[PDB]
Amino acid sequence: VRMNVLADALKSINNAEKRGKRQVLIRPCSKVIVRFLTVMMKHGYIGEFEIIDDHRAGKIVVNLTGRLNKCGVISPRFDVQLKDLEKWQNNLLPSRQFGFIVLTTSAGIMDHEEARRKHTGGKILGFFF
Amino acid sequence: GRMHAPGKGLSQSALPYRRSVPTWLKLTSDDVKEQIYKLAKKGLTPSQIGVILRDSHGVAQVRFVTGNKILRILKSKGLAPDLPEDLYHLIKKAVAVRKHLERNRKDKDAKFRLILIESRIHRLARYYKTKRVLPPNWKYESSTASALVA
């Protein structure tokens, strides 16, 4: 069955991105999905998206700007300490110049650079570059 | 897909977005809940009760009219079945298959289907025991189950 809504969403965005589509329908929708999408929006990797209310899990339509190279999930959500964050960056990101690791921390869902600034480790959610 | 079949069917009910009761329904919540009592007392299962209300009385969703699910309404009035209808119908099927096997012991297919049916019964009964719906020691006794159903 569907064990991970975030994995389904990020994979669906990744496939439409590679296919040159301008919009992608994401189903079902979760707070973790919306917070993950927001992190990509604040960095410009995706355009506006509209959550659609169906009195159910929800559906989303994301506008794609042709900027994502890959938005991948990490399963399982490993615990990431601040000291081990650098070794995760060297393994998941093409370079330090760009690309982000999305962390769920007690402070909130945030990218790896904001977590380093707020001195909070957390559980890894995914990445994009 | 199905737990005990290779089928991946999607057939189901698509509930409308609007939960509000339509204007053309003159049946009040109490009046609908009293009509439920007659049908359940007549010996109809919650599943069936919903069909008669939906087919001939315009009640699309009893929950929308009354705020309560049919089984939850019957529990309050004390008309609820001793055995949950889904579990009851799986036990009833197992009894019928087992009756067939006694006179058709060459039916290796019926033997295979029975194992599937009893597998669903135990998975269902395990769930009901956890939510404390069935006594903490309810066991399906294939020998004595024929008296419970029909």
């Binding site: 399963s75 399982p76 959500r77 490993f78 | -």
Partner: protein
Amino acid sequence: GKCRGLRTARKLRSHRRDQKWHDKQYKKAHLGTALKANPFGGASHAKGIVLEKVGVEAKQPNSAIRKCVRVQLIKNGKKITAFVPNDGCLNFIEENDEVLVAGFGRKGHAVGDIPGVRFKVVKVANVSLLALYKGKKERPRS
């Protein structure tokens, strides 16, 4: 595919433990049969007594008589065939001499065209074969 759940450390550890027996490099050093069966008994070298001089026919596509000796190891009494290197070195060896024997370099496998010989002679009569071959010392003539 492989399991990835956060609580699968035991399953992953157990599986790698089982699948580690399936490569012969690990099973050779961790079963014990190989060490028990090893004529040297896990030693780099072994001394022995020359039982007889034997000639081994080189494998195709070559043709030659490789000069060897049957040796009985002192430490465990096992009998092995040890190749004698170089041109005229078999003449230095005589019957019932103490010979220091080493491996052929392939860790228990035959080397080159000599079939089934996994050992070579380093010293004879407590004098090196190289020093004999190069004229540094002479077979302990009494």
